[PDB]
mmCIF file of all heavy atoms in Angstrom:
data_model
loop_
_atom_site.group_PDB
_atom_site.id
_atom_site.type_symbol
_atom_site.label_atom_id
_atom_site.label_comp_id
_atom_site.label_asym_id
_atom_site.label_seq_id
_atom_site.Cartn_x
_atom_site.Cartn_y
_atom_site.Cartn_z
ATOM 1 N N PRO A 357 -336.581 -12.779 -132.243
ATOM 2 C CA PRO A 357 -336.707 -14.309 -132.297
ATOM 3 C C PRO A 357 -336.512 -14.789 -130.871
ATOM 4 O O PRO A 357 -335.456 -15.107 -130.471
ATOM 5 C CB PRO A 357 -335.549 -14.696 -133.192
ATOM 6 C CG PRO A 357 -334.366 -13.666 -132.785
ATOM 7 C CD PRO A 357 -335.166 -12.430 -132.332
ATOM 8 N N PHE A 358 -337.638 -14.733 -130.069
ATOM 9 C CA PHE A 358 -337.662 -15.125 -128.752
ATOM 10 C C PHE A 358 -337.341 -16.675 -128.755
ATOM 11 O O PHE A 358 -338.216 -17.509 -128.911
ATOM 12 C CB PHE A 358 -338.929 -14.807 -128.012
ATOM 13 C CG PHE A 358 -339.045 -13.448 -127.694
ATOM 14 C CD1 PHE A 358 -339.979 -12.608 -128.300
ATOM 15 C CD2 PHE A 358 -338.380 -12.819 -126.623
ATOM 16 C CE1 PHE A 358 -340.186 -11.285 -127.960
ATOM 17 C CE2 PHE A 358 -338.511 -11.488 -126.296
ATOM 18 C CZ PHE A 358 -339.402 -10.728 -127.025
ATOM 19 N N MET A 359 -336.121 -16.974 -128.550
ATOM 20 C CA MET A 359 -335.504 -18.291 -128.640
ATOM 21 C C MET A 359 -335.751 -19.161 -127.435
ATOM 22 O O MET A 359 -335.016 -20.128 -127.227
ATOM 23 C CB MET A 359 -334.076 -18.225 -129.132
ATOM 24 C CG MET A 359 -333.870 -17.689 -130.551
ATOM 25 S SD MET A 359 -332.120 -17.588 -130.939
ATOM 26 C CE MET A 359 -331.691 -15.998 -130.091
ATOM 27 N N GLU A 360 -336.710 -18.787 -126.563
ATOM 28 C CA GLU A 360 -336.840 -19.482 -125.317
ATOM 29 C C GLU A 360 -338.354 -19.856 -125.093
ATOM 30 O O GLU A 360 -338.641 -20.340 -123.970
ATOM 31 C CB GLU A 360 -336.411 -18.696 -124.178
ATOM 32 C CG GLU A 360 -334.830 -18.448 -124.042
ATOM 33 C CD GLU A 360 -334.380 -17.196 -124.815
ATOM 34 O OE1 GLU A 360 -335.271 -16.478 -125.355
ATOM 35 O OE2 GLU A 360 -333.153 -16.960 -124.896
ATOM 36 N N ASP A 361 -339.216 -19.622 -126.074
ATOM 37 C CA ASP A 361 -340.574 -19.923 -125.763
ATOM 38 C C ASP A 361 -341.401 -20.295 -127.073
ATOM 39 O O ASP A 361 -340.885 -19.971 -128.218
ATOM 40 C CB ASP A 361 -341.376 -18.724 -125.111
ATOM 41 C CG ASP A 361 -341.203 -17.435 -125.914
ATOM 42 O OD1 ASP A 361 -340.410 -17.461 -126.898
ATOM 43 O OD2 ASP A 361 -341.843 -16.426 -125.485
ATOM 44 N N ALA A 362 -342.533 -20.919 -126.861
ATOM 45 C CA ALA A 362 -343.269 -21.315 -128.006
ATOM 46 C C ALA A 362 -344.462 -20.454 -128.340
ATOM 47 O O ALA A 362 -345.129 -20.655 -129.408
ATOM 48 C CB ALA A 362 -343.767 -22.792 -127.812
ATOM 49 N N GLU A 363 -344.876 -19.543 -127.482
ATOM 50 C CA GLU A 363 -346.079 -18.822 -127.620
ATOM 51 C C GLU A 363 -345.868 -17.679 -128.706
ATOM 52 O O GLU A 363 -346.768 -17.453 -129.489
ATOM 53 C CB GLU A 363 -346.571 -18.274 -126.388
ATOM 54 C CG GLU A 363 -347.968 -17.537 -126.496
ATOM 55 C CD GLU A 363 -348.619 -17.228 -125.204
ATOM 56 O OE1 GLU A 363 -347.989 -17.572 -124.116
ATOM 57 O OE2 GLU A 363 -349.675 -16.669 -125.161
ATOM 58 N N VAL A 364 -344.693 -17.126 -128.771
ATOM 59 C CA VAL A 364 -344.394 -16.175 -129.772
ATOM 60 C C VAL A 364 -344.326 -16.767 -131.080
ATOM 61 O O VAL A 364 -344.727 -16.191 -132.119
ATOM 62 C CB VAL A 364 -343.094 -15.399 -129.370
ATOM 63 C CG1 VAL A 364 -342.742 -14.401 -130.410
ATOM 64 C CG2 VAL A 364 -343.233 -14.822 -128.054
ATOM 65 N N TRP A 365 -343.789 -17.995 -131.215
ATOM 66 C CA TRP A 365 -343.759 -18.687 -132.479
ATOM 67 C C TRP A 365 -345.169 -19.133 -132.989
ATOM 68 O O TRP A 365 -345.441 -19.241 -134.168
ATOM 69 C CB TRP A 365 -342.891 -19.952 -132.458
ATOM 70 C CG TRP A 365 -341.410 -19.599 -132.304
ATOM 71 C CD1 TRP A 365 -340.701 -19.687 -131.187
ATOM 72 C CD2 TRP A 365 -340.597 -19.195 -133.368
ATOM 73 N NE1 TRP A 365 -339.423 -19.328 -131.362
ATOM 74 C CE2 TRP A 365 -339.317 -18.979 -132.776
ATOM 75 C CE3 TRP A 365 -340.701 -19.012 -134.720
ATOM 76 C CZ2 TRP A 365 -338.173 -18.639 -133.465
ATOM 77 C CZ3 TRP A 365 -339.622 -18.578 -135.444
ATOM 78 C CH2 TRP A 365 -338.373 -18.420 -134.825
ATOM 79 N N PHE A 366 -346.069 -19.412 -131.967
ATOM 80 C CA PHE A 366 -347.429 -19.639 -132.521
ATOM 81 C C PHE A 366 -348.085 -18.436 -132.997
ATOM 82 O O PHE A 366 -348.928 -18.512 -133.920
ATOM 83 C CB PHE A 366 -348.318 -20.235 -131.327
ATOM 84 C CG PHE A 366 -349.694 -20.537 -131.658
ATOM 85 C CD1 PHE A 366 -349.991 -21.677 -132.436
ATOM 86 C CD2 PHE A 366 -350.678 -19.741 -131.240
ATOM 87 C CE1 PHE A 366 -351.271 -21.856 -132.851
ATOM 88 C CE2 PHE A 366 -352.008 -19.938 -131.691
ATOM 89 C CZ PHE A 366 -352.282 -21.012 -132.438
ATOM 90 N N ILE A 367 -347.804 -17.294 -132.446
ATOM 91 C CA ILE A 367 -348.337 -15.973 -132.933
ATOM 92 C C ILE A 367 -347.737 -15.661 -134.324
ATOM 93 O O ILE A 367 -348.412 -15.270 -135.198
ATOM 94 C CB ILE A 367 -347.996 -14.958 -131.929
ATOM 95 C CG1 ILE A 367 -348.847 -15.159 -130.688
ATOM 96 C CG2 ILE A 367 -348.424 -13.552 -132.446
ATOM 97 C CD1 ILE A 367 -348.405 -14.313 -129.544
ATOM 98 N N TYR A 368 -346.484 -15.953 -134.512
ATOM 99 C CA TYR A 368 -345.762 -15.791 -135.723
ATOM 100 C C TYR A 368 -346.264 -16.728 -136.826
ATOM 101 O O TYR A 368 -346.280 -16.379 -137.945
ATOM 102 C CB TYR A 368 -344.315 -15.906 -135.499
ATOM 103 C CG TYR A 368 -343.313 -15.439 -136.633
ATOM 104 C CD1 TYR A 368 -343.568 -14.284 -137.385
ATOM 105 C CD2 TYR A 368 -342.119 -16.021 -136.794
ATOM 106 C CE1 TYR A 368 -342.710 -13.870 -138.267
ATOM 107 C CE2 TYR A 368 -341.232 -15.643 -137.679
ATOM 108 C CZ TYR A 368 -341.542 -14.566 -138.484
ATOM 109 O OH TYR A 368 -340.687 -14.103 -139.457
ATOM 110 N N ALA A 369 -346.590 -18.014 -136.396
ATOM 111 C CA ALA A 369 -347.279 -18.871 -137.263
ATOM 112 C C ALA A 369 -348.669 -18.508 -137.640
ATOM 113 O O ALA A 369 -349.171 -18.690 -138.697
ATOM 114 C CB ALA A 369 -347.347 -20.269 -136.710
ATOM 115 N N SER A 370 -349.362 -17.866 -136.597
ATOM 116 C CA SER A 370 -350.745 -17.421 -136.871
ATOM 117 C C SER A 370 -350.859 -16.153 -137.640
ATOM 118 O O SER A 370 -351.938 -15.910 -138.176
ATOM 119 C CB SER A 370 -351.546 -17.325 -135.549
ATOM 120 O OG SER A 370 -352.798 -16.911 -135.729
ATOM 121 N N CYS A 371 -349.891 -15.360 -137.682
ATOM 122 C CA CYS A 371 -349.933 -14.154 -138.585
ATOM 123 C C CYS A 371 -349.902 -14.627 -139.992
ATOM 124 O O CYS A 371 -350.584 -13.987 -140.792
ATOM 125 C CB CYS A 371 -348.704 -13.236 -138.296
ATOM 126 S SG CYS A 371 -348.744 -12.508 -136.662
ATOM 127 N N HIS A 372 -349.115 -15.675 -140.397
ATOM 128 C CA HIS A 372 -349.035 -16.100 -141.722
ATOM 129 C C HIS A 372 -350.244 -16.840 -142.119
ATOM 130 O O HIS A 372 -350.634 -16.883 -143.286
ATOM 131 C CB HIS A 372 -347.810 -16.896 -141.986
ATOM 132 C CG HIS A 372 -346.544 -16.168 -141.940
ATOM 133 N ND1 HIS A 372 -346.258 -15.137 -142.872
ATOM 134 C CD2 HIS A 372 -345.453 -16.254 -141.140
ATOM 135 C CE1 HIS A 372 -345.034 -14.674 -142.642
ATOM 136 N NE2 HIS A 372 -344.559 -15.292 -141.555
ATOM 137 N N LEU A 373 -350.990 -17.481 -141.110
ATOM 138 C CA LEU A 373 -352.128 -18.171 -141.472
ATOM 139 C C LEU A 373 -353.314 -17.164 -141.810
ATOM 140 O O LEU A 373 -354.232 -17.482 -142.493
ATOM 141 C CB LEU A 373 -352.621 -19.015 -140.292
ATOM 142 C CG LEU A 373 -353.655 -20.091 -140.379
ATOM 143 C CD1 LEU A 373 -353.394 -21.309 -139.481
ATOM 144 C CD2 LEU A 373 -355.061 -19.591 -140.012
ATOM 145 N N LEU A 374 -353.198 -15.977 -141.294
ATOM 146 C CA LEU A 374 -354.222 -15.008 -141.568
ATOM 147 C C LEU A 374 -354.030 -14.387 -142.973
ATOM 148 O O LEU A 374 -355.029 -14.134 -143.614
ATOM 149 C CB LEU A 374 -354.139 -13.907 -140.482
ATOM 150 C CG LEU A 374 -355.460 -13.128 -140.172
ATOM 151 C CD1 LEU A 374 -355.505 -12.756 -138.739
ATOM 152 C CD2 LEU A 374 -355.771 -12.068 -141.156
ATOM 153 N N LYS A 375 -352.846 -14.211 -143.396
ATOM 154 C CA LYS A 375 -352.576 -13.843 -144.815
ATOM 155 C C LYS A 375 -352.951 -15.006 -145.700
ATOM 156 O O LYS A 375 -353.579 -14.803 -146.805
ATOM 157 C CB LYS A 375 -351.144 -13.450 -145.004
ATOM 158 C CG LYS A 375 -350.676 -12.280 -144.233
ATOM 159 C CD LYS A 375 -351.346 -10.978 -144.738
ATOM 160 C CE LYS A 375 -350.782 -10.446 -146.058
ATOM 161 N NZ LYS A 375 -349.385 -9.961 -145.891
ATOM 162 N N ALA A 376 -352.680 -16.254 -145.337
ATOM 163 C CA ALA A 376 -353.002 -17.462 -146.130
ATOM 164 C C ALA A 376 -354.520 -17.673 -146.060
ATOM 165 O O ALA A 376 -355.049 -18.313 -147.059
ATOM 166 C CB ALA A 376 -352.263 -18.638 -145.611
ATOM 167 N N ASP A 377 -355.236 -17.131 -145.192
ATOM 168 C CA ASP A 377 -356.667 -17.104 -145.142
ATOM 169 C C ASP A 377 -357.282 -16.040 -146.043
ATOM 170 O O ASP A 377 -358.173 -16.321 -146.807
ATOM 171 C CB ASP A 377 -357.247 -16.910 -143.694
ATOM 172 C CG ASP A 377 -358.689 -17.159 -143.598
ATOM 173 O OD1 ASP A 377 -359.302 -17.681 -144.517
ATOM 174 O OD2 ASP A 377 -359.239 -16.686 -142.550
ATOM 175 N N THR A 378 -356.766 -14.836 -145.914
ATOM 176 C CA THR A 378 -357.315 -13.664 -146.612
ATOM 177 C C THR A 378 -357.112 -13.817 -148.114
ATOM 178 O O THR A 378 -358.070 -13.598 -148.853
ATOM 179 C CB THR A 378 -356.701 -12.409 -146.086
ATOM 180 O OG1 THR A 378 -357.142 -12.287 -144.658
ATOM 181 C CG2 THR A 378 -357.200 -11.242 -146.857
ATOM 182 N N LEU A 379 -355.880 -14.181 -148.519
ATOM 183 C CA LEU A 379 -355.511 -14.228 -149.859
ATOM 184 C C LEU A 379 -356.120 -15.426 -150.638
ATOM 185 O O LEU A 379 -356.228 -15.420 -151.875
ATOM 186 C CB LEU A 379 -353.984 -14.205 -150.071
ATOM 187 C CG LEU A 379 -353.219 -12.898 -150.050
ATOM 188 C CD1 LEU A 379 -353.794 -12.028 -151.149
ATOM 189 C CD2 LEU A 379 -353.208 -12.162 -148.718
ATOM 190 N N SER A 380 -356.612 -16.395 -149.849
ATOM 191 C CA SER A 380 -357.271 -17.559 -150.522
ATOM 192 C C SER A 380 -358.709 -17.428 -150.727
ATOM 193 O O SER A 380 -359.597 -18.095 -150.137
ATOM 194 C CB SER A 380 -356.972 -18.834 -149.574
ATOM 195 O OG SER A 380 -357.526 -20.016 -150.162
ATOM 196 N N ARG A 381 -359.023 -16.447 -151.489
ATOM 197 C CA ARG A 381 -360.347 -16.147 -152.059
ATOM 198 C C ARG A 381 -360.343 -16.049 -153.597
ATOM 199 O O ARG A 381 -361.283 -16.320 -154.253
ATOM 200 C CB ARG A 381 -360.901 -14.839 -151.466
ATOM 201 C CG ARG A 381 -361.166 -15.030 -149.911
ATOM 202 C CD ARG A 381 -362.213 -16.077 -149.603
ATOM 203 N NE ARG A 381 -362.573 -16.074 -148.195
ATOM 204 C CZ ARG A 381 -363.457 -16.916 -147.694
ATOM 205 N NH1 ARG A 381 -364.013 -17.861 -148.502
ATOM 206 N NH2 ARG A 381 -363.783 -16.924 -146.388
ATOM 207 N N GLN A 382 -359.179 -15.507 -154.144
ATOM 208 C CA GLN A 382 -358.748 -15.521 -155.549
ATOM 209 C C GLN A 382 -359.456 -14.517 -156.442
ATOM 210 O O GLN A 382 -358.890 -14.197 -157.431
ATOM 211 C CB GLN A 382 -358.832 -16.921 -156.166
ATOM 212 C CG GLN A 382 -357.834 -17.950 -155.538
ATOM 213 C CD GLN A 382 -356.454 -17.543 -155.696
ATOM 214 O OE1 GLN A 382 -355.712 -17.223 -154.777
ATOM 215 N NE2 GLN A 382 -355.931 -17.652 -156.943
ATOM 216 N N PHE A 383 -360.662 -14.095 -156.014
ATOM 217 C CA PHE A 383 -361.344 -12.938 -156.619
ATOM 218 C C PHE A 383 -361.531 -13.061 -158.150
ATOM 219 O O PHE A 383 -361.314 -12.063 -158.882
ATOM 220 C CB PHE A 383 -360.565 -11.616 -156.305
ATOM 221 C CG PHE A 383 -360.584 -11.301 -154.842
ATOM 222 C CD1 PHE A 383 -359.532 -10.696 -154.227
ATOM 223 C CD2 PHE A 383 -361.537 -11.769 -153.984
ATOM 224 C CE1 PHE A 383 -359.436 -10.376 -152.911
ATOM 225 C CE2 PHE A 383 -361.517 -11.563 -152.623
ATOM 226 C CZ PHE A 383 -360.458 -10.822 -152.044
ATOM 227 N N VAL A 384 -361.900 -14.209 -158.556
ATOM 228 C CA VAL A 384 -362.072 -14.494 -160.048
ATOM 229 C C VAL A 384 -363.471 -14.857 -160.284
ATOM 230 O O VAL A 384 -364.161 -14.185 -161.061
ATOM 231 C CB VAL A 384 -361.071 -15.632 -160.554
ATOM 232 C CG1 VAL A 384 -361.427 -15.964 -162.006
ATOM 233 C CG2 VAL A 384 -359.661 -15.190 -160.427
ATOM 234 N N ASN A 385 -363.945 -15.988 -159.747
ATOM 235 C CA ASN A 385 -365.232 -16.586 -160.130
ATOM 236 C C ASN A 385 -366.220 -16.394 -159.064
ATOM 237 O O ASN A 385 -366.315 -15.426 -158.379
ATOM 238 C CB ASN A 385 -364.982 -18.071 -160.384
ATOM 239 C CG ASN A 385 -364.146 -18.329 -161.637
ATOM 240 O OD1 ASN A 385 -364.388 -17.783 -162.718
ATOM 241 N ND2 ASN A 385 -363.127 -19.240 -161.478
ATOM 242 N N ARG A 397 -352.201 -14.499 -163.078
ATOM 243 C CA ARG A 397 -352.292 -14.989 -161.673
ATOM 244 C C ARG A 397 -351.124 -15.883 -161.377
ATOM 245 O O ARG A 397 -351.247 -16.698 -160.459
ATOM 246 C CB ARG A 397 -353.635 -15.798 -161.499
ATOM 247 C CG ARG A 397 -354.881 -14.890 -161.631
ATOM 248 C CD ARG A 397 -356.121 -15.762 -161.488
ATOM 249 N NE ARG A 397 -356.300 -16.599 -162.659
ATOM 250 C CZ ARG A 397 -357.178 -17.540 -162.744
ATOM 251 N NH1 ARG A 397 -357.976 -17.837 -161.767
ATOM 252 N NH2 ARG A 397 -357.283 -18.248 -163.909
ATOM 253 N N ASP A 398 -350.004 -15.673 -161.943
ATOM 254 C CA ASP A 398 -348.839 -16.488 -161.619
ATOM 255 C C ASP A 398 -348.207 -16.081 -160.338
ATOM 256 O O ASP A 398 -347.413 -16.913 -159.774
ATOM 257 C CB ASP A 398 -347.857 -16.320 -162.768
ATOM 258 C CG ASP A 398 -348.387 -16.846 -164.148
ATOM 259 O OD1 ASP A 398 -349.292 -17.717 -164.117
ATOM 260 O OD2 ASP A 398 -347.922 -16.281 -165.113
ATOM 261 N N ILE A 399 -348.549 -14.954 -159.807
ATOM 262 C CA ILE A 399 -347.954 -14.412 -158.556
ATOM 263 C C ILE A 399 -349.000 -14.603 -157.451
ATOM 264 O O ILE A 399 -348.610 -14.745 -156.241
ATOM 265 C CB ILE A 399 -347.673 -12.834 -158.839
ATOM 266 C CG1 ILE A 399 -346.681 -12.832 -159.972
ATOM 267 C CG2 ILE A 399 -347.022 -12.235 -157.586
ATOM 268 C CD1 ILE A 399 -346.512 -11.464 -160.484
ATOM 269 N N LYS A 400 -350.293 -14.596 -157.772
ATOM 270 C CA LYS A 400 -351.354 -14.793 -156.726
ATOM 271 C C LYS A 400 -351.175 -16.245 -156.227
ATOM 272 O O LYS A 400 -351.544 -16.568 -155.032
ATOM 273 C CB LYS A 400 -352.699 -14.649 -157.237
ATOM 274 C CG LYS A 400 -353.152 -13.245 -157.357
ATOM 275 C CD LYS A 400 -354.538 -13.219 -158.084
ATOM 276 C CE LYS A 400 -355.601 -13.887 -157.216
ATOM 277 N NZ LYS A 400 -355.944 -13.076 -155.963
ATOM 278 N N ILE A 401 -350.719 -17.258 -156.968
ATOM 279 C CA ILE A 401 -350.599 -18.580 -156.514
ATOM 280 C C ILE A 401 -349.562 -18.713 -155.494
ATOM 281 O O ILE A 401 -349.764 -18.966 -154.312
ATOM 282 C CB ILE A 401 -350.353 -19.530 -157.707
ATOM 283 C CG1 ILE A 401 -351.495 -19.463 -158.759
ATOM 284 C CG2 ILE A 401 -350.164 -20.966 -157.232
ATOM 285 C CD1 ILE A 401 -352.818 -19.881 -158.210
ATOM 286 N N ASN A 402 -348.243 -18.491 -155.909
ATOM 287 C CA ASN A 402 -347.058 -18.924 -155.083
ATOM 288 C C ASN A 402 -346.825 -18.175 -153.856
ATOM 289 O O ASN A 402 -346.140 -18.669 -153.002
ATOM 290 C CB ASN A 402 -345.873 -18.859 -155.941
ATOM 291 C CG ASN A 402 -345.608 -17.479 -156.641
ATOM 292 O OD1 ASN A 402 -346.389 -16.541 -156.437
ATOM 293 N ND2 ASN A 402 -344.633 -17.398 -157.480
ATOM 294 N N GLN A 403 -347.398 -16.909 -153.704
ATOM 295 C CA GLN A 403 -347.364 -16.200 -152.544
ATOM 296 C C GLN A 403 -348.094 -16.863 -151.394
ATOM 297 O O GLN A 403 -347.675 -16.853 -150.210
ATOM 298 C CB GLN A 403 -347.826 -14.761 -152.706
ATOM 299 C CG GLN A 403 -347.588 -13.845 -151.510
ATOM 300 C CD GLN A 403 -347.904 -12.403 -151.822
ATOM 301 O OE1 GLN A 403 -348.331 -12.079 -152.913
ATOM 302 N NE2 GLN A 403 -347.746 -11.605 -150.821
ATOM 303 N N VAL A 404 -349.250 -17.464 -151.727
ATOM 304 C CA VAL A 404 -349.974 -18.205 -150.649
ATOM 305 C C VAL A 404 -349.267 -19.416 -150.287
ATOM 306 O O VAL A 404 -349.245 -19.793 -149.071
ATOM 307 C CB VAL A 404 -351.414 -18.515 -151.245
ATOM 308 C CG1 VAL A 404 -352.221 -19.257 -150.208
ATOM 309 C CG2 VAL A 404 -352.109 -17.253 -151.628
ATOM 310 N N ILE A 405 -348.609 -20.076 -151.172
ATOM 311 C CA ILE A 405 -347.768 -21.265 -150.877
ATOM 312 C C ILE A 405 -346.567 -20.862 -149.877
ATOM 313 O O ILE A 405 -346.241 -21.619 -149.022
ATOM 314 C CB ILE A 405 -347.223 -21.955 -152.151
ATOM 315 C CG1 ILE A 405 -348.341 -22.745 -152.737
ATOM 316 C CG2 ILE A 405 -345.931 -22.798 -151.939
ATOM 317 C CD1 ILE A 405 -349.119 -22.098 -153.859
ATOM 318 N N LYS A 406 -346.021 -19.685 -150.068
ATOM 319 C CA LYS A 406 -345.024 -19.157 -149.157
ATOM 320 C C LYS A 406 -345.604 -19.018 -147.796
ATOM 321 O O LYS A 406 -344.995 -19.482 -146.798
ATOM 322 C CB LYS A 406 -344.530 -17.768 -149.630
ATOM 323 C CG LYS A 406 -343.734 -17.908 -150.918
ATOM 324 C CD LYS A 406 -343.332 -16.543 -151.426
ATOM 325 C CE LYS A 406 -342.396 -16.689 -152.663
ATOM 326 N NZ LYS A 406 -343.021 -17.444 -153.705
#
Side-chain angles (χ1 to χ4, degrees):
Chain A
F358 284 109
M359 292 177 281
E360 294 90 4
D361 55 353
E363 186 169 358
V364 181
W365 292 101
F366 179 74
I367 294 168
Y368 190 44
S370 177
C371 293
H372 290 294
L373 194 147
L374 208 151
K375 298 293 284 290
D377 189 13
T378 296
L379 276 302
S380 180
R381 298 295 189 183
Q382 294 297 111
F383 296 150
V384 174
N385 290 314
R397 290 178 291 171
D398 299 331
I399 303 168
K400 281 175 66 69
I401 301 297
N402 55 3
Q403 187 172 2
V404 180
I405 282 96
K406 291 174 174 63

